[PDB]
Nucleic acid binder design. Structure first.
Lengths: 137, 79
DNA sequence: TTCTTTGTTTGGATGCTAATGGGA
DNA sequence: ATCCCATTAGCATCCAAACAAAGA
């Protein structure tokens, strides 16, 4: 009855039951969309089915995937996540250079850099945080 | 009825040799035939293939016209 | 069902990293 | 508000499965 073995058995069970319904990893993620105000990528469904998420993350998706499966075998507000958008190469090189000059640009510098690269403030802000991560590794 | 996949250049061409080897040499399995045609095909010149590659195009066009909504959906077999 | 080929399409896997949560 | 960074989550990409033909 171990937390991990149940989670362990559900991914397997889930998958079989999924292939049974002749359902694609992508279809399930799509179906979660209607249901919870946020879609789930094919990547996420695959990782789930293969035990490649954190324990915490998996335990949280179990319920959503379980409800969906059952509902399918029978037969001041929040925001929907921002779509992930790649950093074009030219921008990458520029941001890459600015990072060398310094890793802690300020708000206005961030606003400046973004304005200069014709990029969204927030994206640039987030990039310096993430690139600062990739650094300390 | 279930909609089959349209034939590619190799499938069109092999369709020919298949008989001109099967009847010519019975008791032989399609497996061995496929192996052979396989080898023979990868030896044809872009000029010897061109007509089958061309006929394959028409077959592909013919397929869409007759199945405007067909989408290939291979399903990961159960195992 | 398998046995076999090529070519074509699609599913699923996975690096890298983008975006989020929520603490402070 | 801010700002910070441990977490969560997906674009891009690449590889291998499915499948047409045929009929033992």
């Amino acid at each position: 009855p171990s937390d991990l073995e149940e989670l362990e058995q559900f991914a397997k069970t889930f998958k079989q039951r999924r292939i049974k319904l002749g359902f694609t990893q992508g279809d399930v993620g799509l179906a979660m969309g209607k249901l919870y105000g946020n879609d789930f990528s094919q990547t996420t469904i695959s990782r789930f089915e293969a035990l490649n998420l954190s324990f915490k993350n998996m335990s949280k998706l179990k319920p959503l995937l379980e409800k969906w499966l059952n509902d399918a075998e029978n037969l001041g507000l929040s925001r929907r996540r921002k779509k992930r958008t790649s950093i074009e190469t030219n921008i990458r090189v520029a941001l890459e250079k600015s990072f060398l000059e310094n890793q802690k640009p300020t708000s206005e510098e961030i606003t400046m850099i973004a304005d200069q690269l014709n990029m969204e403030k927030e994206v640039i802000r987030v990039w310096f945080s993430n690139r600062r991560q990739k650094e300390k590794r | 009825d279930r909609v089959k996949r349209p034939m590619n250049a190799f499938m069109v061409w092999s369709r020919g040799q298949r008989r001109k080897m099967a009847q010519e040499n019975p008791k032989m399995h399609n497996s061995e035939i496929s192996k052979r045609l396989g080898a023979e095909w990868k030896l044809l010149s872009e000029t010897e293939k061109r007509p089958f590659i061309d006929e394959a195009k028409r077959l592909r066009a013919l397929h869409m016209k007759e199945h405007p909504d067909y989408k290939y959906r291979p399903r990961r077999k159960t195992k």
